[PDB]
């Protein structure tokens, strides 16, 4: 009859994910361009905006984007974000560009079959499949928070920045890295993470708009209520705090999403002071 296949997802999505190369000028002694790193990217819209991973393009002298159709472009770095490890490139194209399928009203579910699209080891575009293993993720050992999607679709070096799509070829996430664990004793099999497309999309528009993601650094680090890890700053310059609770911030039950999104430079009423939000370091 007809073979079981996710080819339909491949035909619709794959043309839009690119091979990203990071080339440096001080990599060899002859200062000729040489790949220092490589990964994948996803063309988001026809203006040439492409999402990828920050660690893939970090400190590059030239970023090369290669499409499955054979065209190659030099890419401009419009902005990146350490917190999510997302970067946004821009190629200047004419004649049209293939763009990733997006369904802004689709909610990813644990168990949804997904396909990872990328260039593992520079073997060329390869597709792997698994499912969405988890959502709202990444260790209980954070620093700066941004939650992921977890999948068992085989992810390898080179897959970074690439696409994780469902069976309809809809963009579910941006693959970021395969849990290669913290040490030794065994190699984790099937544990990979991706930035949910909703988050990836918002962050991209912010980098496109402001060239960087402006957040909300009020000045109250901890380890709700004022905690105990580190000392405060401009956040106490309006609300005395060293060990006190906090009811609701900005007229809503109290959460740093709004904090970071409140727009630095606006006096905010915090129940249990009139502090004015500031921009992250």
């Amino acid at each position: 009859m007809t073979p079981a296949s996710y080819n339909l997802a491949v035909r619709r999505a794959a043309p839009a994910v690119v091979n990203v190369y990071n080339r440096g000028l001080n990599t060899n002694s002859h200062n000729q361009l040489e790949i220092r790193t490589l990964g994948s990217g996803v063309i988001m819209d026809q203006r040439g905006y492409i999402i990828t991973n920050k660690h893939v393009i970090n400190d590059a002298d030239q970023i090369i984007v290669a499409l499955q159709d054979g065209r190659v472009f030099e890419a401009l770095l419009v902005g990146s974000d350490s917190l999510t490890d997302l970067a946004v490139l821009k190629i200047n194209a004419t004649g049209g560009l293939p763009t990733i399928p997006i369904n802004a009203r689709r909610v990813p579910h644990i168990g949804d079959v997904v396909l990872a699209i990328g260039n593992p080891y520079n073997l060329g575009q390869t597709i792997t499949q698994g499912i969405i293993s988890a959502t709202g993720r990444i260790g209980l050992n954070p620093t700066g928070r941004q939650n992921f999607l977890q999948t068992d679709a085989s992810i390898n070096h080179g897959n970074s920045g690439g696409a994780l799509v469902n069976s309809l070829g809809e963009l579910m996430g941006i693959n970021t890295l395969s849990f290669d664990k913290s040490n030794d004793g065994e190699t984790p099999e099937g544990i990979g993470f991706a930035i949910p497309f909703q988050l990836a999309t918002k962050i991209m528009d912010k980098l496109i708009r402001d060239g960087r993601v402006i957040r909300g650094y009020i000045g109250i680090g901890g380890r709700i209520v004022v905690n105990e890890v580190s000392p405060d700053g401009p956040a106490a310059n309006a609300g005395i705090q060293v060990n006190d609770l906090i009811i609701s911030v900005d007229n809503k039950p109290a959460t740093m999403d709004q904090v970071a999104e409140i727009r630095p430079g606006s006096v905010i009423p915090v129940v249990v002071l009139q502090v004015t939000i500031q921009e992250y370091p």
């Binding site: 700066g144 928070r145 650094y217 000045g219 680090g221 901890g222 905690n227 890890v229 740093m256 904090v259």
Partner: peptide, 4 residues
């Protein structure tokens, strides 16, 4: 842990 956290830092606002």
């Amino acid at each position: 842990v956290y830092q606002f």
